[PDB]
Amino acid sequence: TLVHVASVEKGRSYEDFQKVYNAIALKLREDDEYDNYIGYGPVLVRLAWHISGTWDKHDNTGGSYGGTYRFKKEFNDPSNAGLQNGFKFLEPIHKEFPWISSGDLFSLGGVTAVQEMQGPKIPWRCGRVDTPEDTTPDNGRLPDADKDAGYVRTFFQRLNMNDREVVALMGAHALGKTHLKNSGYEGPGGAANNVFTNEFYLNLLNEDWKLEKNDANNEQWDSKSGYMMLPTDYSLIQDPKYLSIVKEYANDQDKFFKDFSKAFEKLLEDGITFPKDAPSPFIFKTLEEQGL
Ligand code: HEM
Ligand SMILES: CNCc1ccccc1
Known about the structure:
This is Peroxidase. It is found in: Mitochondrion intermembrane space; Mitochondrion matrix. Its EC number is 1.11.1.-. This protein has helices at 14-30, 34-37, 41-52, 72-75, 84-96, 102-116, 149-157, 163-170, 180-183, 199-206, 231-238, 240-250, 253-269, 287-290, and strands spanning 4-5, 177-178, 187-188, 210-213, 219-222, 228-229, 272-273. By secondary structure, the chain is mostly helical. The strands form 3 sheets. Strands 4-5-6 form a 3-stranded antiparallel sheet. It has a two-stranded parallel sheet with strand order 1-7. Helix 3 packs across helix 6 (102-116), helix 8 (163-170) crosses helix 12 and helix 11 (231-238) packs across helix 12 (240-250). The radius of gyration is 18 Å and the shape is globular. The N and C termini lie far apart (44 Å). Protoporphyrin IX containing FE binds at residues 42-43, 45-46, 49, 82, 143, 145, 152, 169-170, 172-173, 175-179, 182-183, 185, 230, 232, 264.
């Protein structure tokens, strides 16, 4: 097992990171046209997850710590097609705040996006440190979407996530959409795809899903409302253990928010050793809470 010890960017404290948060949040508000007016929130959430989801608990390779998405091997992972948009969004932020590590920036982008989209508070810790190009994980550690519940369950064991954590994390698929050219899947999951809600679960349960083929010749579940579910999304109502948890989150928005927050923080922190005298996690104020 590799050890990656969090090291606070020199002399920085909460206020410095709140300024970075605010710059991301202001740019989210400004650059509103992206992806037919969805805006950049969803893609920044996906970026934070994909830079974290390379982690392997068995040897501590991958994970958010090293900021390795900046290197070509990872940037060009077919699993990451489309995330270049999130990276380009963050470039002016990094230029303004060149002191933040890449992993801190990519993970903070996700936190900022969730919160600005009216999601739960996500505590966040600084101290990821850029690591060299040879530490970039090989392609193929992110999950396939054409598979079943057993695949999902097994996949997420590598990330140390249990059934509840998996079902909670998947609720992020209320955000944004699938794009045929990126992933071979097309369409949104619901009507509210740049506001963070529990609509993924409601739509799973309440829509009439039909197994269809899309224009890339892949199967996906479609509804007459114009929404879709990936096979891995739909697996959460095929498996009886997942189904129970889907029903719980469909019926309790606060529970969903609390469980998502904990699972997302955990995802973003996997692989990182925090010294006992490290700062406590930061909880950033939204622009709205600041009157900004
Ligand atoms: C079994 C696990 C998962 C699979 C197979 C999967 C698959 C996908 C696919 C195929 C897309 C569409 C990409 C595109 O065409 O642009 C997507 C989008 C997205 N995923 Fe996942 N995903 C998984 C888990 C997660 C998790 C755990 C999160 C975060 C907590 C997440 C967040 C997102 C977001 C926010 C988008 C929308 C991106 C956009 O609109 O640009 N996904 N996912
Ligand atoms: C909710 N199912 C469609 C979808 C999957 C991934 C991201 C957004 C939407």
